[PDB]
C-alpha cells in the first residue's frame, strides 16, 4: 500500500526499490503571442528515478522534440514517464530490477501499472510523503545536463556523492530531503548557504560540496532555520 511516516525504514532495507518523480518531465514557459494571446514553449525535462538505499539516480532527460505534434501533453507526460521507467527496468539485469516502484504522484499509478503488466511481481505504490524531488532541477549539475541535451539521453548520478562511506542510507536520505526541501522553499538562500564559503568545493565527480562531518551539521542546521523561517515569512509567525 501507500508509503508514509509509519513505514519509513522500509526504504533502507535490502529489497531493491525506486522512487519515480514525474514533476519535471513536462516543463514550459508561458508567454504572450504577438496577437496578445498566451502560448507555451516547452523546455527540456527529466524523469527523476532514485534508489534511496544506494543513491543511484537514473536521470532520463526528456528532450522537447518528444512533444512535437502531440496533444494533451500533461497526460502524455505521465505515460511517457511510465514508458521510460518500464524501458529502464527491462534494461536492467534481473537481479537489479526493483521489487517495488514508489511514485511520488498518484496520477502515475495507472500509467505505470499498465506499462509494467509484464512485471506482475513488481509492486507499484503511492506515497503519503510530500517529497521534495521537484527541486532536483535546483542542483546545478543536474539542471545543466538537462538544459544542454540535444536529444534523449539517460545520465547516471549518485545523488549522495560519497556520503555512504561515512553515514547510513537513512541519514543520507534525510540529508538529501532536507537539502531539497530547502532548495524548494527558498532556492536563493539555500544555494547561498551551500556555497557561501569558497574554500569548500564540489568535486568534479560530485553534486554537492565536500563538507566535513562538522560542516554538514552546521549546513543542516542552516537549512532547518531556512525552512522554519520561510514557513514564518510565509504564514507570518
Amino acid at each position: 500500500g501507500a508509503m508514509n511516516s509509519s513505514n519509513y525504514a522500509e526504504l533502507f532495507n535490502n529489497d531493491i526499490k525506486l522512487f519515480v518523480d514525474d514533476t519535471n518531465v513536462y516543463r514550459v514557459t508561458v508567454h504572450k503571442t504577438f496577437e496578445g494571446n498566451v502560448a507555451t514553449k516547452a523546455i527540456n525535462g527529466c524523469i527523476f528515478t532514485l534508489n534511496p538505499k544506494t543513491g543511484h539516480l537514473f536521470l532520463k532527460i526528456i528532450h522537447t522534440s518528444v512533444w512535437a505534434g502531440q496533444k494533451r501533453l500533461s497526460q502524455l507526460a505521465k505515460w511517457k514517464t511510465a514508458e521510460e521507467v518500464s524501458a529502464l527496468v527491462r534494461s536492467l539485469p534481473k537481479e537489479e530490477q526493483p521489487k517495488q516502484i514508489i511514485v511520488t504522484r498518484k496520477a502515475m499509478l495507472d500509467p505505470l501499472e499498465v506499462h509494467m503488466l509484464d512485471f506482475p511481481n513488481i509492486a507499484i505504490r503511492p506515497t503519503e510523503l510530500r517529497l521534495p524531488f521537484s527541486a532536483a532541477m535546483s542542483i546545478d549539475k543536474l539542471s545543466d545536463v538537462v538544459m544542454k541535451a540535444t536529444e534523449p539521453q539517460m545520465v547516471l548520478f549518485n545523488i549522495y556523492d560519497d556520503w555512504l562511506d561515512r553515514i547510513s542510507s537513512y541519514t543520507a536520505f534525510s540529508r538529501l530531503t532536507l537539502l531539497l526541501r530547502a532548495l524548494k522553499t527558498n532556492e536563493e538562500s539555500a544555494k547561498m548557504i551551500l556555497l557561501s564559503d569558497p574554500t569548500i568545493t564540489i568535486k568534479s565527480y560530485h553534486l554537492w560540496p565536500s563538507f566535513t562531518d562538522e560542516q554538514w551539521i552546521t549546513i543542516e542546521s542552516q537549512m532547518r532555520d531556512l525552512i522554519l523561517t520561510e514557513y514564518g515569512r510565509k504564514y507570518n509567525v
Binding site: 502524455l76 505515460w79 514508458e83 495507472d110 499498465v114 506499462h115 509484464d118
Partner: protein, 300 residues
C-alpha cells in the same frame, strides 16, 4: 402458453416469476404458474419468509422441456425438476387448472418490459455461464461468486461470466499502452466482440443476464459484470452505431425496472457518471441519460 406446476407449498415464501411476485402462505393450496409466455427465457425465484437470506431461483425456457417445482425438506428449498413423462405432466397440469389452483402470469398486453429486458438472453448461453449440464434449467442465488471473483472458491457453483479487466495484457496491446487504456475500442471490438463473443447480440445477452441476476438475487458479482460491460462500451471511441442505439434501449429498460429503493446498492456512481458525462459515449445514450436524471439525480 406454458405452465410450471408446484407439487405443494410447505413453507411460506415470496415467489417471483420474471418481474412479478406474490406471497404464498405455509401449506397454502398453491400449485403453480400458468399462462407463461412462450418465446422468452423466464426466471422463477424464491425468498423464504423466515430467512430473507438467500434469494434463489431458476432460469428456464418452456420450449426445452416440462418443468415443475417441488419443495425438498432435506435441502430446505424449492427445487426445479424436469418431468420426462409428457402425459403425466399434461394430466397434472390439467387437473390443477380445473381446480384453479394456479396463478396466471400477469402480463399486460401493452407491456413489453420482459421482452425488452431479455431481448438477447438465450438459454444456451445461460447454461454456459451457469454450468450444470444434466439440467435444462439453471440455478442462481445471492451468494454465488463469479470466476473473476474466484481469482481475486467452489468452481462448480460459480458464475462463469466473461472476464473483463481493463489493466490486463488481454486489454492492452504492447506498445499501445496509453492508446488502449484511454480508448478501449480494440479490446471491445477485436478481443471481445470479434474474438470471444463473436457478435454484439451475445455480448448484450450476457450484459442483460448479469443485470437480471443482480436485480433479482442481489448477486454482487453479477452487478460488477453488468457495470464492466457497460463501461467497456462507453470507454470505446469506436463503437458500431447500431450497438450504441441498442445499448441505450437496453439500459433504459433496466433503469426503468430497477426498484427505486435498491438504486443505492445496485448502481455504481463512478461508472454511471463516467459513462453519461465523461466517456466517449457521453452524448450517445439519450434515453438512458434522461431516465437516470429524472429517477436517480442524487447518484449524479
Amino acid at each position: 402458453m406454458n405452465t410450471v406446476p408446484f407439487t405443494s407449498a410447505p413453507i411460506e415464501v415470496t415467489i417471483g416469476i420474471d418481474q412479478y411476485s406474490f406471497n404464498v402462505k405455509e401449506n397454502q393450496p398453491f400449485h403453480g404458474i400458468k399462462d407463461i409466455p412462450i418465446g422468452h427465457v423466464h426466471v422463477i425465484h424464491f425468498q423464504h419468509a423466515d430467512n430473507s437470506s438467500m434469494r434463489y431461483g431458476y432460469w428456464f425456457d418452456c420450449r426445452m422441456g416440462n418443468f415443475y417445482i417441488q419443495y425438498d425438506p432435506k435441502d430446505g428449498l424449492y427445487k426445479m425438476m424436469e418431468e420426462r413423462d409428457g402425459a403425466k405432466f399434461e394430466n397434472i397440469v390439467h387437473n390443477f387448472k380445473e381446480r384453479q389452483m394456479m396463478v396466471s402470469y400477469p402480463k399486460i398486453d401493452e407491456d413489453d418490459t420482459w421482452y425488452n429486458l431479455t431481448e438477447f438472453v438465450q438459454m444456451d448461453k445461460i447454461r454456459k455461464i451457469v454450468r450444470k449440464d444434466e439440467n435444462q434449467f439453471s440455478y442462481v442465488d445471492s451468494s454465488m461468486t463469479t470466476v473473476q471473483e474466484n481469482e481475486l472458491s467452489d468452481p462448480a457453483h460459480s458464475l462463469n461470466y466473461t472476464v473483463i479487466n481493463f489493466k490486463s495484457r488481454e486489454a492492452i496491446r504492447p506498445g499501445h499502452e496509453m492508446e488502449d487504456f484511454l480508448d478501449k475500442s480494440y479490446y471491445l471490438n477485436t478481443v471481445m466482440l470479434q474474438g470471444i463473443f463473436k457478435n454484439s447480440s451475445n455480448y448484450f445477452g450476457e450484459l442483460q443476464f448479469a443485470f437480471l441476476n443482480a436485480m433479482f438475487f442481489g448477486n454482487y458479482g453479477s452487478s460488477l459484470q453488468w457495470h464492466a460491460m457497460i463501461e467497456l462500451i462507453c470507454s470505446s471511441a469506436t463503437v458500431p452505431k447500431h450497438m450504441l442505439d441498442k445499448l441505450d434501449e437496453i439500459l433504459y429498460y433496466q433503469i426503468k425496472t430497477l426498484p427505486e429503493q435498491y438504486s443505492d446498492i445496485l448502481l455504481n456512481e463512478r461508472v454511471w457518471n463516467i459513462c453519461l458525462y465523461s466517456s466517449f459515449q457521453k452524448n450517445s445514450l439519450h434515453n438512458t441519460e434522461k431516465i437516470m436524471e429524472n429517477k436517480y439525480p442524487e447518484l449524479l
